[PDB]
A paper describes a structure:
A previous report showed that a F. novicida transposon mutant with insertions in cadA (FTT_0406), which encodes a putative aspartate aminotransferase fold (AAT-fold) pyridoxal 5′-phosphate (PLP)-dependent lysine decarboxylase (hereafter referred to as LdcF), was attenuated in mouse spleen. Bacterial AAT-fold PLP-dependent basic amino acid decarboxylases are grouped into a superfamily termed LAOdc because these enzymes decarboxylate lysine (LdcI, LdcC and LdcA), arginine (AdcI) and ornithine (OdcI and OdcC) into corresponding polyamines (cadaverine, agmantine and putrescine) while consuming protons and producing CO2. LdcF sequences found in Francisellaceae strains display a high level of sequence identity (83%), and contain four functional regions, corresponding to a wing domain (Pfam ID: PF03709), a PLP-binding domain and a AAT-like domain (both corresponding to Pfam ID: PF01276), and a C-terminal domain (Pfam ID: PF03711). It uncovers the important role of this previously uncharacterized protein in survival in the host cells through participation in oxidative stress response, thereby identifying LdcF as a potential drug target.
We were able to determine the structure of F. novicida LdcF from X-ray diffraction data collected to a resolution of 3.4 Å. In agreement with the relationship between LdcF and LdcI families disclosed by the phylogenetic analysis and the relatively high level of sequence conservation, structural alignment between F. novicida LdcF and E. coli LdcI dimers extracted from their respective decameric crystal structures demonstrates a high overall similarity, with a root-mean-square-deviation (RMSD) of 1.043 Å over 1,223 aligned atoms. Like LdcI and other LAOdcs, the LdcF monomer is organized in three different structural domains: A N-terminal wing domain involved in stabilization of the ring assembly though inter-dimer contacts (residues 1–130), a central core domain which contains a covalently bound PLP cofactor (residues 131–564) and a C-terminal domain (residues 565–713), which partially constitutes an entry channel into the active site. The core domain encompasses a linker region (residues 113–184), a PLP-binding domain consisting of a seven-stranded β-sheet surrounded by eight α-helices (residues 185–419), and an AAT-like domain which harbors an antiparallel four-stranded β-sheet and three α-helices near the dimerization interface (residues 420–564). While the overall structures of LdcF and LdcI are very similar, some notable differences were found in both the AAT-like and the C-terminal domains. Moreover, a comparison of the ppGpp binding pocket in LdcI with the equivalent region in LdcF revealed that, despite the overall high sequence conservation, only two out of 10 ppGpp-interacting residues are conserved between the two proteins.
Author numbering:
A (entry chain B), B (entry chain A): -5 to 711
C (entry chain C): -5 to 174
The structure:
């Protein structure tokens, strides 16, 4: 009923050179399907074409085939693509079934050639509208259905289903741009038929339970203000001010944000990295009981054994921890994986024992997985899931949920995250991830195959050498490709779908004589309309998601080796990078691409930046004061602003966040000493290097550029 | 360029009986406007019709009139409706201008009757597409423009502009339902052309500054997780754990939520109310220096004079404080109005000195106004503004902003709140509020005019007797209509647009012999598809917003006196309230509406509920422990669960929230004693009364209904 | 849903010599009602004609009238003929209600002259299909609904929903005569 695809197509596939009366039959119900309830139609010669189309277009919503075109193979493939898809086999009184389908569960019905044709046309339409109703998840379906009502409300939201946008001109332009339905599904608790999110009521409860069942979770919660909010919910549930928490040193901005409002003391788990500035794994040693007890003794406050653990898995650049090996070693009852970058983890075999929800909670221990559903699944931004496992307290976590969830949640986002769960439900999800995985691996192999053919220099991939078999490849001490120190046997895996491209300039995780900085590649990808996830000094991160077709990757390939063409060409910066040229044409007057690149590479070789960034994040500065209490001193006022140089031997009042590499260097309350001088040297270097060449800049969040230009940091008391 | 209204109409208005060659001229450019760039057209007889249409339809985007139809009046009225609206006056070489337009600034150009007609059609199209570009606010326009690009991205969000929803069927149904553009404008910071929200960069800054200028604010911040989040931002900026805060006792759920994670002690400002359970104003006395200093001495913890003040203005039911009179009396430097229910306040004269932003911050004192833009303007849910005033610290509030704002904000919501500012910009906003105000007053006057004619009983309005003049009427001690105690001269105003309907049953703010409970009216409004904002035991709240047409109010009128018709009819509960009847037809077998209603009224008269609710919220229970520390005890575990009866003499661990009236009764950490026995009596009464009649229920958030049904509350230690 | 009169007619009655933009409004939703879900339309000059027609034809299933043509008498008579019959009054931002209707229980909704016309056309269609569902008695409605299912039965009666009449010629003539 009025809820269906945009391009509703029904695929007629009967073998060409049918009988005359069977052709008239299938065409009568084709016209009938068109002229009643506005369908679209394809005609094909065999079912093999349909399975091709289904892997690209999913707005086909029925298959009616003459029995001649019946194919055992296609039905096996259609089975593994869409079990609910309506199928119709038209046959006369002559032929019985193929036995393969006894077991196979498709939505097959059988028509007989006869007088009644428009009857079948109505029969087909019904089983289609059933298919359309029976594919939305509960709350989404409920929400969508409500939209079609006409309610005449005197309540919130104030736009009251769109009527408020119509009164003004700019309102009308906004309304038309975004579409009727987004406003008609913008409801509040004042429309009681859906219940509440914070209450987990009629519709919402059904949605929350659905998601939990889908992700193999004991209990799941939907969050409409990003994983940043989900992380804080977990914390304020697990942690009361006073006890100690175990923190991944390479954690999200939001982890610190949580620490900053509860009087809690962290010990950080020292992770590895390479000269590229790629986040590595926390070695197993750090998780051991003895390492924890010792680090507690050495911390300043350090109440006792941590009640709370937060480890980011996977890393931004796609390294995966074995979650089984971690839980075996971590005797912390509230341990929380920040799995923002792997909501798909639980749906593919290659991630066996690499997602939180895969482990059985140890007796009276609680597991938390926070996932950013929008980050790598199909959902609206700000939409996130909170999966928990084991014995838990609804009475108190509901309050922790209420602490951060708004009282007027935006229902389309609620629907969107539930719908993303329904996308992953069943072997539907497996194929969805399998595609993006196979595509990524193809891009990896296709790029090194180009490196072989390539003359002179060429790009490279941050991956093992042998990637023949399709797995999340395991890092090994032996191989120097990852550039990490002391990695354990069978602990770290590489996520195939996260492709890090490497530009010449890093030999043995240190500086290089000749190179080509990544910044001059990123800009060239930007000139040719390509958006990169992250750009290192010599690396480049592309994330192949379920929204990445092979065509996109061919575009990426073609522009990439074109950059080499135009760089070996040594074309003018004007003709090659017009945006960079336009920033200062006086400076780039007759400059060519090689001059610009080599001058940037020279200044990094002169600054000795790679191993500076190495030793900067490989030391951990003396923690003087609780991040919470450091922020509190900002409020209370006891803090003074002194230049970056004078940060030495003082206690930082705010977080410092340099780009590159886009990683917290120091948290609020920590202090730099002789031991941790490395980080301040790296910072002061970023200043000089960030100025020199126009168009290539540096940023450090936390300090303040004054009138005089000098950058002061606020230090405590 | 490809950004325009849906029904782009251009109004031709030339006086009937034109000249033959002038007729053909205007028609040649009408056809040209239709067949090129797909315009729609109206023809009218005089400009007076146009001003009528413009006040109902704002997708007319040009007016081309023959000079005969020129009207001095209409052009003054069109001026006060849309100055940017393109106007075209076609005239021959015969007539000079009317002088009125010297002052008036319309978008008038002048055409001359001649050969070149299609030229003018192109000239008209340009000045229209200029109008379409020049009405969106900066970030919204920038966001909308980006949608039209084709970027081939390998970044977040994972749906990558919608391409991820296409791979699956349920994805496609979700994608089609909501529309292409909502996904193409779902961006991240990874597309650097817009900058960041938390950074307040190129596009965002322009939007943030625009809003601040629009609402007459020193500095404004946009919030994408509701005012609930905005409130917490304000708090964690203004408050460090240890000092005391001044709280409106009738505050939002979110105010407490803020208190629960900062170690802060509140003193509550006792507000008034009536038997109906309508939230009243805090009397001026409570704000005085002596009342504050005294209540501090009397509190348990009470560090010192509060650094932070939070008062909710307006009330849920539309009572307004004089913000000037408050700031004069409250020597608290960080004072924060929770103006969720009045984002429109600053745009209409009747709210003079009733909004925060209207007062000059006292030297070194900071003012905060948090507004729920979605609550009573045209914006998406979760969208809220944070307006501040005076000397402030960006370096620290940026951290407070970052503490609660997600790292991946949903850009359409960002755009939506900025667009809502642009809707209010200029006298555009004045007329928008003036309409909803005049409509409200009309509904009020027409309803009491119906009460006069009405036979026997009828509804009433919670308003003064004399409402002849169009003002925010001021409450007076003398008049018994508001039922409040000790109201000050010129302190409390009634917001016209918030209509509270009253059903018989409350005589002199106490019980009544005969009545008709509001619940049996709400259900009847629900049966007839009408959504109420809030329902009291004998009241009903309709909020007339800018999304409320007169047709809605006539629908509301017609169903209302129909309820009286069917109640005086004494129709069967089956035929009158089928949903209620269906819940238990065994019980309502042959019951009529009067029996059901009178039995409910009798049980409230027997329970003595109205004055029970009165004395419940008019006492304030002994605060035993900080709300923060009470919640912390849940985490730490020191808490036991005992039934509601046994809450007496114990310290509550969680907030209790009864419906009715939908107001916090006790906060975490407070304790009931003999003095505050009233509230627990009211609670235990709500149990008995909530059971008895089927379909009419009661709810109390905070306790827990067990297996046996009995409701335990968790009490501390 | 697919259960309705044969001649589904919707009576537009707006006073001749309407305003130009109000004429286009009611006609835009008249065409919209025709071309989507196949309605039939009458145009009349006053409501007095409608009460005449209702006492002869009961396949009119909605009345959408401009507020000019509002009539106190006809609404009292329509009340005593069909309380459930959908009524729609289109009016601009100018006029409040006549008090007679306070007591009278019709199926009146109110439209406002504005941009959104096809929206109202969808709003009208919904309140009509509600009227069509809400007039059959329980068992009749249940029986009628079942007919629209496709069940593939192996039970009694032996004709199994008509399929048995199709196999023979005389069967087909009997089936066609009496109807699916």
């Amino acid at each position: 009923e009025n809820l269906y695809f945009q391009g509703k197509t029904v695929v007629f596939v009967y073998k060409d050179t049918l009988k005359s009366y069977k052709e008239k039959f299938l065409l009568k119900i084709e016209k009938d399907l068109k002229n009643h309830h506005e369908y679209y139609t394809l005609k094909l010669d065999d079912l093999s074409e349909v399975v091709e189309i289904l892997e690209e277009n999913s707005r086909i919503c029925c298959i009616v085939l003459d029995r001649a075109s019946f194919n055992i193979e296609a039905f096996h493939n259609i089975a593994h693509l869409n079990t609910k898809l309506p199928i119709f086999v038209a046959s006369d009184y002559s032929q019985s079934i193929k036995l393969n389908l006894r077991d196979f569960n498709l939505n097959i019905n059988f028509l007989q050639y006869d007088a009644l044709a428009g009857e079948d046309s109505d029969f087909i339409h019904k089983t289609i509208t059933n298919y359309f109703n029976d594919i939305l998840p509960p709350l989404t379906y409920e929400l969508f259905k409500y939209s079609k009502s006409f309610n005449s409300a005197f309540c919130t939201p104030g736009h009251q289903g769109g009527y408020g946008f119509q009164r003004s001109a700019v309102g009308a332009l906004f309304y038309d741009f975004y579409g009727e339905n987004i406003f008609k599904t913008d409801l509040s608790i004042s429309m009681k038929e859906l219940g509440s999110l914070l209450d987990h009521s009629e519709a919402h409860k059904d949605a929350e339970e659905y998601i939990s069942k889908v992700f193999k979770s004991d209990r799941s919660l939907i969050v409409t203000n990003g994983t940043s909010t989900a992380n804080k919910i977990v914390g304020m549930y697990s942690v009361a001010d006073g006890d100690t928490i175990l923190v991944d040193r390479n954690c999200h901005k939001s982890v610190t944000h949580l620490m900053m409002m509860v009087d809690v003391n962290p010990i950080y788990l020292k992770p590895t990295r390479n000269a590229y500035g790629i986040i590595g794994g926390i070695p197993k040693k750090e998780f051991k009981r003895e390492t924890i007890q010792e680090k507690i003794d050495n911390s300043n406050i350090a109440d006792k054994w941590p009640e709370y653990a937060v480890v980011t898995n996977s890393t931004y650049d796609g390294i995966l921890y074995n979650t089984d090996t971690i839980h075996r070693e971590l005797d912390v009852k509230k341990l929380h994986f920040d799995s923002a970058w792997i909501p798909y983890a639980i749906f593919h075999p290659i991630y066996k024992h690499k997602s939180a929800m895969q482990i059985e909670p140890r007796p009276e221990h609680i597991i938390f997985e926070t996932q950013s559903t929008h980050k790598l699944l199909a959902a609206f931004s700000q939409s996130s899931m909170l999966h928990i496992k084991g014995d838990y307290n609804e009475e108190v976590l509901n309050e922790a949920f209420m602490l951060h969830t708004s009282t007027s949640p935006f229902y389309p986002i609620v629907a969107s995250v539930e719908t993303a769960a329904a996308m992953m439900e069943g072997e539907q999800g497996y194929n969805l991830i399998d595609k993006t995985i196979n595509l990524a691996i193809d891009f990896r192999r296709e790029l090194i195959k180009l490196r072989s053919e390539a003359n002179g220099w060429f790009f490279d991939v941050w991956q093992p050498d042998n990637i023949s078999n399709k797995e999340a490849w395991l890092l090994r001490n032996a191989d120097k490709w990852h550039g990490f120190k002391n990695v354990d046997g069978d602990f770290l895996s590489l996520d195939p779908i996260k492709i890090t491209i490497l530009t010449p300039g890093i030999k043995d995780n240190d500086v290089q004589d000749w190179g080509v900085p990544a910044d001059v590649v990123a800009k060239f990808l930007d000139e040719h309309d390509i958006v990169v996830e992250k750009s290192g000094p010599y690396s480049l991160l592309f994330i192949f998601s379920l929204g990445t077709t092979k065509a996109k990757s061919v575009r990426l390939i073609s522009v990439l080796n074109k950059f080499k063409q135009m760089y070996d060409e040594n074309t003018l910066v004007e003709k090659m990078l017009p945006t960079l040229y336009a920033e200062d044409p006086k400076f780039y007057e007759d400059m060519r691409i090689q001059e610009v690149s080599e001058r940037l590479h020279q200044y990094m070789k002169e600054a000795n930046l790679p191993n500076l960034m190495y030793h900067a994040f490989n030391v951990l500065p003396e923690q003087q004061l609780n991040p919470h209490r450091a922020f509190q001193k900002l409020l209370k006022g006891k803090v003074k602003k002194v230049p970056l140089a004078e940060l030495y031997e003082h206690t930082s009042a705010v977080m410092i966040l340099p780009y590159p590499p886009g990683i917290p260097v120091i948290f609020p309350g920590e202090k730099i000493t002789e031991e941790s001088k490395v980080i301040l040297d790296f910072l002061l270097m970023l200043e000089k290097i960030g100025s020199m060449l126009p168009g290539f800049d540096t940023d450090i969040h936390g300090p303040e550029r004054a009138k005089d230009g000098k950058l002061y940091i606020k230090v405590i008391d």
